[PDB]
Design a protein around this ligand. Sequence first.
Ligand SMILES: *[C@@H]1O[C@H](CO)[C@@H](O[C@@H]2O[C@H](CO)[C@@H](O[C@@H]3O[C@H](CO[C@H]4O[C@H](CO)[C@@H](O)[C@H](O[C@H]5O[C@H](CO)[C@@H](O)[C@H](O)[C@@H]5O)[C@@H]4O)[C@@H](O)[C@H](O[C@H]4O[C@H](CO)[C@@H](O)[C@H](O)[C@@H]4O)[C@@H]3O)[C@H](O)[C@H]2NC(C)=O)[C@H](O)[C@H]1NC(C)=O
Ligand SMILES: *[C@@H]1O[C@H](CO)[C@@H](O[C@@H]2O[C@H](CO)[C@@H](O[C@@H]3O[C@H](CO)[C@@H](O)[C@H](O[C@H]4O[C@H](CO)[C@@H](O)[C@H](O)[C@@H]4O[C@H]4O[C@H](CO)[C@@H](O)[C@H](O)[C@@H]4O)[C@@H]3O)[C@H](O)[C@H]2NC(C)=O)[C@H](O)[C@H]1NC(C)=O
Ligand SMILES: *[C@@H]1O[C@H](CO)[C@@H](O[C@@H]2O[C@H](CO)[C@@H](O)[C@H](O)[C@H]2NC(C)=O)[C@H](O)[C@H]1NC(C)=O
Ligand SMILES: *[C@@H]1O[C@H](CO)[C@@H](O[C@@H]2O[C@H](CO)[C@@H](O)[C@H](O)[C@H]2NC(C)=O)[C@H](O)[C@H]1NC(C)=O
Ligand SMILES: [Cl-]
Ligand SMILES: [Cl-]
Ligand SMILES: [Cl-]
Ligand SMILES: [Cl-]
Ligand SMILES: [Cl-]
Ligand SMILES: [Cl-]
Ligand SMILES: [Cl-]
Ligand SMILES: [Cl-]
Ligand SMILES: [Cl-]
Ligand SMILES: [Cl-]
Ligand SMILES: [Cl-]
Ligand SMILES: [Cl-]
Ligand SMILES: [Cl-]
Ligand SMILES: [Cl-]
Ligand SMILES: [Cl-]
Ligand SMILES: [Cl-]
Ligand SMILES: [Cl-]
Length: 627
Amino acid sequence: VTVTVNKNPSHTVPSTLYGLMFEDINHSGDGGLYAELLQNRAFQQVTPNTAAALAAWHPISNAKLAVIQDPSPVSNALPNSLQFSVPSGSSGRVGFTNEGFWGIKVDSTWTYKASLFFRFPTSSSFSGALTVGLQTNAGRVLAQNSTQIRGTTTKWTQINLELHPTASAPDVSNSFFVTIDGAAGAGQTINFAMFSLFPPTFKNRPNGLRADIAETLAEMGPSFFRFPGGNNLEGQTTATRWQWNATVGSLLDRPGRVGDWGYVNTDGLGLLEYLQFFEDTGMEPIMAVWAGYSLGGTSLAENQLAPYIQQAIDQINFVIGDPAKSAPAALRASLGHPEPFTLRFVEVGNEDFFAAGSYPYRWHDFVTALQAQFPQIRFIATTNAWNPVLSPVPQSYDVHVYQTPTWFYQNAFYYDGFQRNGTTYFEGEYAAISTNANDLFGTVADGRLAFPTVQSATGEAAFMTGLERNSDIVFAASYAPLLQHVNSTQWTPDLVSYDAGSVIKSTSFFAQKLFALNKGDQYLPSTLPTNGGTLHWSITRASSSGKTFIKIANAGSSAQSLTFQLTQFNSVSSTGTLQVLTGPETASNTPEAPQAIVPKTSTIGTGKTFTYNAPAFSVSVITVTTN
Ligand SMILES: *[C@@H]1O[C@H](CO)[C@@H](O[C@@H]2O[C@H](CO)[C@@H](O[C@@H]3O[C@H](CO[C@H]4O[C@H](CO)[C@@H](O)[C@H](O[C@H]5O[C@H](CO)[C@@H](O)[C@H](O)[C@@H]5O)[C@@H]4O)[C@@H](O)[C@H](O[C@H]4O[C@H](CO)[C@@H](O)[C@H](O)[C@@H]4O)[C@@H]3O)[C@H](O)[C@H]2NC(C)=O)[C@H](O)[C@H]1NC(C)=O
Ligand SMILES: *[C@@H]1O[C@H](CO)[C@@H](O[C@@H]2O[C@H](CO)[C@@H](O[C@@H]3O[C@H](CO)[C@@H](O)[C@H](O[C@H]4O[C@H](CO)[C@@H](O)[C@H](O)[C@@H]4O[C@H]4O[C@H](CO)[C@@H](O)[C@H](O)[C@@H]4O)[C@@H]3O)[C@H](O)[C@H]2NC(C)=O)[C@H](O)[C@H]1NC(C)=O
Ligand SMILES: *[C@@H]1O[C@H](CO)[C@@H](O[C@@H]2O[C@H](CO)[C@@H](O)[C@H](O)[C@H]2NC(C)=O)[C@H](O)[C@H]1NC(C)=O
Ligand SMILES: *[C@@H]1O[C@H](CO)[C@@H](O[C@@H]2O[C@H](CO)[C@@H](O)[C@H](O)[C@H]2NC(C)=O)[C@H](O)[C@H]1NC(C)=O
Ligand SMILES: [Cl-]
Ligand SMILES: [Cl-]
Ligand SMILES: [Cl-]
Ligand SMILES: [Cl-]
Ligand SMILES: [Cl-]
Ligand SMILES: [Cl-]
Ligand SMILES: [Cl-]
Ligand SMILES: [Cl-]
Ligand SMILES: [Cl-]
Ligand SMILES: [Cl-]
Ligand SMILES: [Cl-]
Ligand SMILES: [Cl-]
Ligand SMILES: [Cl-]
Ligand SMILES: [Cl-]
Ligand SMILES: [Cl-]
Ligand SMILES: [Cl-]
Ligand SMILES: [Cl-]
């Protein structure tokens, strides 16, 4: 096919076009991006005197463990303690282990920071060392540190010790431990709370993020981060919704919450940790606020909304407010960040097409109040576009689609027929999740993708060529979900997978990275692809350099050739770069073969006329200079 490129740009490509969608799913927060290594670190939101309260915790030797509702807790936000007792007639190391989130990576080049709180509920004459460390799950110590404690310590006391392993472990089958000498400790009871173990973090931020995951997200070149949900924003009930103010300040004041994916969230990854990550990566937020609906189906009545509207104003003031003018803005300053953060976009709710009966008054009342406080923010509606009719008129809508790979190439012209009437569209969640059109959300046996495939990535890439062509009205787009712990999964496929030790970049990750890193600010019109065909392309140009990015998705089973005609331009470079992602249709990156499918980069001859043979199931980028 001959593709003639117009030397005259039609529109500017928004700076925000490609970004990330985040919620705590598949242990993407706790156990994922948040660097904390201990699971169930503070017994948040568990029922005392149950086995489930002791999740991830195990005795060493004859230790007796129970999670209790502490008559004197370390904080009212953390009402549960671990009650540790050593039987009389004991000797040798006695204590407990934390198995982590299906392991702990022990690396000799890393310094770890361990901490815990303890007290003796009854004053005793105990005198001896409290040792913390890292061991193999077989029981051999890889790193340790200790401090002297006394049984007269009846007040809650924090212990802070560093750990230096000298060996890396051979695998991630390792545990954190806390022990005393069982002879010195025989008959003793100690209450413990609020445990923590951190590795070195991204940009050395206190309470920060896991470095290999954070660097992988930065490598994609994203322009925005949508957070904190997603379903995980909404709660099962009004009482279980995400609340900003429960995620800020001391870890002793963060109660945690049961999220929407079966596990407790510590809220250790809270609002200030998010905002610091954006500052550290150059991403801007698309921040959601809770809008009066929860996933059990309850809408708050219109006359019940006012306190929830004020809580959304407080959340925004924390991000952008003048510290002299509000308590939340003064709180951000008191936490070490008096400058406001960037915030241009706020999403009102999540998937309110499920609650469209009440969204018109929830939208009206939230946006009337929030727009008056923050005239400079763009508020994004979450119902289906224009049905129901909202007031005030939304400037933007969030559109989600999960479909087959074939649907994505067949619908690359989704936005071409939309009116240009001042509304912008956010593709806030998309993915090709299954080859089964009639059971998309089923099992792997019935066509669900365990991991993205070359087929799914090339379909998504065809759909993305249409997002770019229509970027006069499409301002932003994010694959979802972003992250997956391979040992605790509620949804597949996901963009980036990991275990306690390593990260797997999917085919879909490489497609997102190829699109986001090779994006100009000028859209160059070209010959239109066939509407419903397998072969798609989009051309953009960097106004300052004349770098010209030709993106080509062949989502079909046969090779196709393209003849590019750039004879309108004054000058085209004699050479260009080629970046290709291709492989067998059903090939995936997996924990067993994590680099099965990776892009190949080369340099090719180009000029005003050149030909490219797009392999079956491929995503290609050709970069030339034009003026
Ligand atoms: C920008 O341009 C867009 C596109 O033209 C405008 O979008 C239109 O907005 C109006 C409201 O402002 C919508 O009108 C409502 O229409 C429904 C009937 O919907 C059905 O019929 C439509 C043809 O009329 C059709 O477009 C619809 O298709 C959509 O939904 C289906 C699935 O549901 C989907 O398959 C399609 O792809 C579309 O997504 C649908 O089949 C009608 O019931 C409404 O009447 C109620 O509300 C009005 C106004 O308050 C009231 O007077 C009535 O009494 C009643 O209460 C209402 O007319 C129209 O559907 C939108 N069109 C599309 C394509 O979405 C948009 O308004 C423009 N914005 C600006 C800023 O100008
Ligand atoms: C995050 O912030 C949200 C707000 O955006 C917080 O949620 C709000 O929590 C407050 C405090 O719980 C709650 O306000 C109370 O509503 C209660 C239940 O309907 C009222 O009973 C209560 O009035 C009493 O307490 C006030 C002081 O808190 C007194 O000033 C008042 O006179 C009342 O006093 C009686 O009751 C108390 C016992 O509480 C007693 O000491 C007195 O002697 C007297 O008997 C409050 O007004 C809000 O309704 C909640 N708002 C929302 C939107 O949910 C949330 O808790 C924060 N989370 C964290 C972790 O900090
Ligand atoms: C045990 O932990 C202590 C407390 O973290 C470590 O002591 C710190 O070591 C660092 C690096 O030398 C110093 O900057 C801190 O000032 C020390 N703090 C205190 C309070 O002493 C000690 O290095 C650790 N020991 C081992 C063997 O790992
Ligand atoms: C976490 O998941 C990983 C990846 O699936 C598991 O490691 C695999 O385990 C199976 C079953 O033993 C083996 O056949 C594979 O060789 C393992 N793969 C890799 C890449 O190591 C791991 O066992 C899981 N961990 C826990 C604690 O369940
Ligand atoms: Cl032709
Ligand atoms: Cl022209
Ligand atoms: Cl120009
Ligand atoms: Cl039980
Ligand atoms: Cl368990
Ligand atoms: Cl043992
Ligand atoms: Cl015993
Ligand atoms: Cl006993
Ligand atoms: Cl030691
Ligand atoms: Cl020391
Ligand atoms: Cl509460
Ligand atoms: Cl205020
Ligand atoms: Cl398919
Ligand atoms: Cl399943
Ligand atoms: Cl075909
Ligand atoms: Cl072929
Ligand atoms: Cl020439």
